Symmetry: D2
Subunit: 267 residues, 4 copies
Amino acid sequence: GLLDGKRILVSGIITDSSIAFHIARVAQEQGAQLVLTGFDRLRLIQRITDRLPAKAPLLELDVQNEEHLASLAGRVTEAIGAGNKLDGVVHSIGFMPQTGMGINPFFDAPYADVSKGIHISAYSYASMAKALLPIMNPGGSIVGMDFDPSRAMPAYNWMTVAKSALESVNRFVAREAGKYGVRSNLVAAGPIRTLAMSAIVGGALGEEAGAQIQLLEEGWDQRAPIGWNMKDATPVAKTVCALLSDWLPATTGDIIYADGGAHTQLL
Amino acid sequence: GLLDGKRILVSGIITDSSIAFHIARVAQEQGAQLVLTGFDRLRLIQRITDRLPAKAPLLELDVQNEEHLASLAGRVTEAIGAGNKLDGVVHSIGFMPQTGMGINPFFDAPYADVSKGIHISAYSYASMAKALLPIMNPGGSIVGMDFDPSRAMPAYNWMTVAKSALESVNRFVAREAGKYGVRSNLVAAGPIRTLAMSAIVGGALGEEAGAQIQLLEEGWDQRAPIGWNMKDATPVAKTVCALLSDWLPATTGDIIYADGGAHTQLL
Amino acid sequence: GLLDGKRILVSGIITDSSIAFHIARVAQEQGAQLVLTGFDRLRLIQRITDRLPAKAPLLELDVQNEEHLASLAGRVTEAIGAGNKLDGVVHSIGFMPQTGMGINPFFDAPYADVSKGIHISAYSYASMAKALLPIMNPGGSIVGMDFDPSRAMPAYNWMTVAKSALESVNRFVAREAGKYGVRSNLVAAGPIRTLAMSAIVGGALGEEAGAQIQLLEEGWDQRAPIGWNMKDATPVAKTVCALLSDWLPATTGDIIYADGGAHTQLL
Amino acid sequence: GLLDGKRILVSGIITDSSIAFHIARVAQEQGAQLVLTGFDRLRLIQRITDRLPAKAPLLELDVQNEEHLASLAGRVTEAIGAGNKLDGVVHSIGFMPQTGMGINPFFDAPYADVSKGIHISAYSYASMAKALLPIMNPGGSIVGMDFDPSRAMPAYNWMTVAKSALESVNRFVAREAGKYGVRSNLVAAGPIRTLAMSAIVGGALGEEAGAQIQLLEEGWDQRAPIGWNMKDATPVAKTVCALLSDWLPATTGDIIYADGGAHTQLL
Ligand SMILES: NC(=O)c1ccc[n+]([C@@H]2O[C@H](COP(=O)([O-])OP(=O)(O)OC[C@H]3O[C@@H](n4cnc5c(N)ncnc54)[C@H](O)[C@@H]3O)[C@@H](O)[C@H]2O)c1
Ligand SMILES: NC(=O)c1ccc[n+]([C@@H]2O[C@H](COP(=O)([O-])OP(=O)(O)OC[C@H]3O[C@@H](n4cnc5c(N)ncnc54)[C@H](O)[C@@H]3O)[C@@H](O)[C@H]2O)c1
Ligand SMILES: NC(=O)c1ccc[n+]([C@@H]2O[C@H](COP(=O)([O-])OP(=O)(O)OC[C@H]3O[C@@H](n4cnc5c(N)ncnc54)[C@H](O)[C@@H]3O)[C@@H](O)[C@H]2O)c1
Ligand SMILES: NC(=O)c1ccc[n+]([C@@H]2O[C@H](COP(=O)([O-])OP(=O)(O)OC[C@H]3O[C@@H](n4cnc5c(N)ncnc54)[C@H](O)[C@@H]3O)[C@@H](O)[C@H]2O)c1
Ligand SMILES: O=C(NCc1cccnc1)NC1CCCCC1
Ligand SMILES: O=C(NCc1cccnc1)NC1CCCCC1
Ligand SMILES: O=C(NCc1cccnc1)NC1CCCCC1
Ligand SMILES: O=C(NCc1cccnc1)NC1CCCCC1
């Protein structure tokens, strides 16, 4: 297996469509011993994760909760056994109130909402790193889920801003991570039809935003030289695993594009 | 004059070393009729602005204050006279608590501090745009002060993250601004020895951070093909005015580097 | 005038639709004393340039001709009068054989053709700089015409490669230029319907390439927050003049986008 | 093994210090069945490649020779056996005459020399792709060796320009490659002390260029969060193999930085 004998912490599972669910599945297929972290609906995350190729301890983590982060390292160690450390940390956490995404005009998102979104979607990449780096082995790897925010786009609005902030956070996490011999990087993925994304397209955040995001998401497979199948997280999950492996040993504070090459193409 | 008959709102003056003080001065030398906005210490801002080539009404603006922003357009109109609009808006506002910059480890900045910093340094670019765009003329221009955050650097820490967020904000402000026939852009300046910057170099945010920033700032004049004089904001102030003028009519959601070309050079 | 008392060399005029014809016109409207350089069809360039707001000496320059480049400085001095130097140099020169652009598959362009294209479109930016920098004044400016090649696009093929090379050349010209106190920069313009571009759209380099370029060119005005009118070089010509002026004094080895902001927008 | 049952063509071996020698070695350690291509000194390349973990047929390829490229696919098929195709193609070919690199002023490189350099270092990435894509399997991979040319640097001069051109070429090769279900990407490596690089540092292309390149190369390990050991190609060779594998399935027309993260850091 690619990740044989590796202890990897995988955050972000909420449904069977979560990118993290596919990251977890592939890493287990590649021999990783995982520890999962869930938020709020833990009875659901447990039931969802029962479908993973193997059993993995589930720990609760609200990245906005300062006690959860402080108690994280200890709780992780209790699950993996004393004397054992993590080799991989996967941040697949993202959130933005409806004021920040969708139909709501960009100027109408109040700061308290944008702040909540940058805390969960960007600051938490450094929060997780702080907590987990003392219990990470040299050669270890932190991977975060990004969406290319280099250019503005319709509807994605403040969530775009949170991604720009996260790409900056990552470059700084890399500086700290490196002192522990650990790499920190992001995977900028093409659009993936998660339950939330599907709802949006179906008009959950308004019709105008839904049409904008359906058009936006169709432009990937057109630009992408090798195509883009938005109903398939496996190519994304495989890239995350390439970064958790020992095959990208000189890459840190960087972004790897699992987007079918669509970002390299104008038309 | 370059800005002849132009009504430009200039925010950010605090001392005679402020980049905004030099933006104000050059714009007045180029024939602009200005309206200034100050924060907290208004008796000081008035006394400092008495040294500008001409008189300009000073209005109070705490970008974190929702009433100031709501009352802004009306107060600006009262100063410029009803029936008159703004042609230019200058955002030269930035702030980050000491936990976010300096010696304090990157992981030790609490979110409430980083959030305060992203609100004042990034979100406020959209707050100002919202307020002022209804009272801006077609062909108008919004300019913001940026510091190239494309790569991580010592000590600048979370303020780097706030700049990355601001560059993203700008791309989105441009989308809204354009509906009013107004351009929105940033000027990524090289280091300028303001009173605050000088204090930092002198050890205000710790010795380690001071040495890092002195080294950092000396690398500009070495990389820069035309040199970089950090004791001179005039080249920066001139670039801001080029963007307020009618000579960059097809540039929006963009960054203009007034850094001596140092960003284009490795060594 | 913006360029009052400035002596600017303007290359690239071939027809009344040439970007250089509009650069020349605006610079003359802004008070510049110009020297023009033409290639091959000089009787035509003279007749075309008779329509400029003022008279300007026309000099012959085949950038592939080593004698023309060697004799350039002397011939320029003879036209502007001994003791006088240039303040501005405009490179608006570009060429790629049909094998390199259009319908012809990318793999089917022979090297001798691509080489001819990189010589005229990229290397010549350094050739012109070499020749003209000894007869340029401190504070002077070299400006070149670019087309954003950051991402691949249909039909533009090897001409894209020549632009990528030119952006690299510029960064290096800036290093040499700076020793003379002169800035070197490029203007990455949005598509302009020149006679050549119109012919292409009309099927001159094949129907498939024509349709690709018409689609490509229509995407500018859709992405561009302030719009993009491809039948109007005036916004481009104005930007070139902003770089020839004294209002961008700290910008070198850089690119300024006169594209309506379309490069900053995904959709 | 990572590359188990994969047939990979590896170009660029000249000495035991060649990046390609290490790409070959790692790919063989990971189970790849290789075909090597050499230039000019084939008796030497054979003797050097005798030290590879396994035997691999050596084929002659002067990328400037149109017959070699035409006969390539047939010769490769004869070596791997009819009915068998390539899964991987490694371009580790680069060259620039002394006029283009080193002490020689940037303006003093004649075009015939720069052209020779862009042909071998950039155009040949498309030449190899053309030749080998008809004999490549779906899921296949083309990898090229890049050196980050985003910013100008001392001494590297026209070779920088050739890299900028190659990054553009790659984005276009990706468009063609994709029709065959094949990915095309580059690895932008940090400096590697090959025999040629060592000679340069030792004054082979002049003392001024040698000092510039020694200083340049020392800046990597300082910027790089995880460090940079220039006497070790193994991290580079491992990254090339990650791209030849099935673990980066949604990455094409892209660049992967095996530079210790030094490009993500200012200081
Ligand atoms: N879906 C796409 O099109 C797409 C594309 C590229 C990147 N991404 C990114 O991938 C990541 C995963 O998103 P996804 O699309 O799989 O959706 P998702 O809904 O399945 O995952 C997001 C996760 O964030 C968790 N979360 C929210 N608030 C939290 C908090 N306070 N503390 C801890 N966890 C919290 C949720 O429980 C959920 O598990 C996100 O960063 C997203 O921005 C998504
Ligand atoms: N000094 C440098 O080296 C440098 C270089 C490039 C860019 N910049 C940027 O230029 C801008 C101006 O900075 P400066 O260096 O002239 O320093 P400065 O201290 O003179 O200006 C910053 C201004 O922000 C104002 N401000 C702070 N909090 C505010 C709030 N809540 N509401 C309204 N105004 C508020 C302050 O009153 C001050 O006038 C900033 O965005 C800064 O990041 C600075
Ligand atoms: N038209 C567009 O859509 C567009 C957009 C952005 C940038 N550009 C760039 O702007 C520049 C000017 O192009 P244009 O669109 O005005 O077309 P153009 O045909 O009017 O100008 C190109 C010029 O190159 C000259 N030239 C060709 N070979 C030469 C040689 N060997 N020596 C000297 N001069 C030579 C021609 O005489 C002509 O004057 C080019 O660099 C082009 O790539 C064009
Ligand atoms: N050494 C570094 O610091 C460094 C860093 C990053 C990238 N690179 C790149 O890696 C690649 C390999 O370089 P290297 O450093 O291992 O040096 P190298 O000398 O070992 O390899 C270059 C190869 O190019 C071959 N070659 C030259 N002309 C040729 C032609 N006409 N046809 C076919 N092959 C030809 C040579 O035989 C040699 O095998 C190059 O593209 C180089 O630019 C080098
Ligand atoms: O980042 C996300 N999607 C990327 C995207 C953007 C535009 C179009 N298509 C996809 N989604 C996240 C939003 C916050 C909750 C977790 C999921
Ligand atoms: O952005 C600022 N400085 C840029 C910089 C960074 C690193 C080195 N030298 C300069 N300063 C601002 C900080 C917040 C209060 C206003 C000023
Ligand atoms: O650079 C040029 N056009 C840019 C462009 C690309 C794609 C679509 N629309 C416009 N044209 C030049 C070609 C060589 C002769 C001079 C003109
Ligand atoms: O690309 C190469 N080196 C990268 C580099 C640049 C600057 C400093 N250190 C390293 N070298 C190649 C030159 C042409 C022959 C093959 C090797």
